[PDB]
Amino acid sequence: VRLPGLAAMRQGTRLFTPEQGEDLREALRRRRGSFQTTCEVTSETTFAAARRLREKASALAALNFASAKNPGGGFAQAQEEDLCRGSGLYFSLTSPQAEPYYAVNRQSHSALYTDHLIYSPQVPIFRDDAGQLLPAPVPVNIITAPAPNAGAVAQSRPEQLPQVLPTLRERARRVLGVAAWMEQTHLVLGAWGCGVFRNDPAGVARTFRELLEGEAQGAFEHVTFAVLDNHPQHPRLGAFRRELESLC
Numbered sequence: 001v002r003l004p005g006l007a008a009m010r011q012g013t014r015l016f017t018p019e020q021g022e023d024l025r026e027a028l029r030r031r032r033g034s035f036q037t038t039c040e041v042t043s044e045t046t047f048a049a050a051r052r053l054r055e056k057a058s059a060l061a062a063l064n065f066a067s068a069k070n071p072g073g074g075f076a077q078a079q080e081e082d083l084c085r086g087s088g089l090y091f092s093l094t095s096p097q098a099e100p101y102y103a104v105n106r107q108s109h110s111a112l113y114t115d116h117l118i119y120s121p122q123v124p125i126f127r128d129d130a131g132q133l134l135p136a137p138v139p140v141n142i143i144t145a146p147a148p149n150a151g152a153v154a155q156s157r158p159e160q161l162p163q164v165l166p167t168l169r170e171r172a173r174r175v176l177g178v179a180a181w182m183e184q185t186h187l188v189l190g191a192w193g194c195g196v197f198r199n200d201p202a203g204v205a206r207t208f209r210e211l212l213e214g215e216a217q218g219a220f221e222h223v224t225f226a227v228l229d230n231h232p233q234h235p236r237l238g239a240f241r242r243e244l245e246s247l248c
């Protein structure tokens, strides 16, 4: 039997294409300065922060650190695979209206990828980090978008090194734009493509702070930076807790 709410979520899945770039930013324009946005930086999985936030969240979204070319990356410690294994996310990403995101990114043949985004509405979270069933599934809206593959650019197309940060910046700005366009209140963010994609975590953390301070100030009610870091150094979390203490 097909698990609860997968149908309604897959049927509602929706693609934002790069030609919606200005539709997304006028949605940020229109929503800027609506709340006193409270923001944290934590050590939880993105789904653990989602399930915690749920009961006081009118509209909850979370960022999938996605593969540009294969849904769920093709599966093996990554965050996108954590969400697929414990939610209906995969049934949404393989949905027909989502195909152009993968199709175009592969034809792109560029490690900075395109600006397509996939919006997955009311994705059921079925399991906690331990992997046991929840009593009841917890819905979370998911924004899927690929951070530029910095590691690949450095080994494959170093001429696009200068475009890495600008790509991540305009794409981050569209991720906020999709969440305001869908009028979300509570965002679960994190160390976006600072793992397998090898971006600088100080840089991703700073880009988020620039946006949350600039074009997206006030635009959301709560932003939680759910960075998981098991390495004894904790380099990712340290960079996000260090660079976003200004904002909290």
Ligand SMILES: Nc1ncnc2c1ncn2[C@@H]1O[C@H](COP(=O)(O)OP(=O)(O)OC[C@H]2O[C@H](O)[C@H](O)[C@@H]2O)[C@@H](O)[C@H]1O
Binding pocket: 044, 045, 046, 047, 065, 066, 067, 068, 072, 073, 074, 076, 077, 078, 079, 080, 081, 082, 083, 147, 190, 191, 192, 193, 194, 195, 196, 197, 198, 199, 226, 227, 228, 229, 236, 237
């Ligand atoms: N479940 C998790 N929850 C919250 N944060 C996490 C989690 N797992 C890792 N992090 C933290 O977030 C950081 C980045 O996690 P990454 O999964 O590497 O995303 P990317 O931007 O580097 O590239 C995504 C590729 O990886 C896959 O193959 C995709 O299919 C893509 O191909 C990690 O270092 C953790 O600190």
